[PDB]
């Protein structure tokens with residue numbers, strides 16, 4: 001009937017997930033346990049597209065509101081990925097952030113990164129998408145591409161930036177970054 005992804009990805013939502021909100025939650029395990037909401041289990045390309053299209057625009061939700069796409073329903077914990085890293089993308093307008101999200105998700109879930117960068121290795125298991133507004137940029141959206149190995153971030157950063165340029169985004173439309181685990 002429909003076309004299976006290489007792996008199903010579980011989609012969850014953590015509302016207004018901020019560092020000073022885990023102040024209300026003293027521990028990470030219990031903050032997630034209580035706040036995370038399950039949204040869907042993407043098995044196919046058809047399921048993928050309807051989910052991506054149905055997603056309520058990140059900036060509209062509260063500051064810190066994250067969407068987690070976790071390969072084979074893995075726990076998106078830094079703890080789970082010790083030799084890893086997370087490639088960051090900040091998108092200044094909500095308009096560009098749609099095009100950007102569509103690229104980064106199609107590259108991850110569609111195994112684009114896997115066969116274009118990792119030579120077959122499934123290095124990416126988590127993609128987080130959250131609202132991170134500034135007094136400066138209030139429509140700001142952040143994408144995190146989680147890696148199992150930091151050796152690859154050196155190659156994920158030019159690949160994602162090149163893809164985003166091809167997707168229509170200028171250099172003022174986004175900023176690439178990294179955060180070690």
Ligand SMILES: CO[C@@H]1[C@H](O)[C@@H](COP(=O)(O)OP(=O)(O)OP(=O)(O)OC[C@H]2O[C@@H](n3c[n+](C)c4c(=O)[nH]c(N)nc43)[C@H](O)[C@@H]2O)O[C@H]1n1cnc2c(N(C)C)ncnc21
Nearest residue numbers: 017018019022028064066076077078079130132177178179
């Ligand atoms: C370049 O890299 C910079 C830093 O290295 C990295 C630190 O991440 P956070 O503290 O945001 O944290 P995180 O990305 O996890 O945010 P979020 O998940 O939404 O909520 C944070 C809270 O959630 C907790 N948390 C969240 N997660 C996902 C976990 C997890 O897996 N394990 C554990 N133990 N805790 C987790 C965390 O401890 C904290 O209390 O963020 C980059 N950064 C740079 N500028 C900014 C900026 N500006 C200018 C406004 N705002 C935000 N991040 C910025």
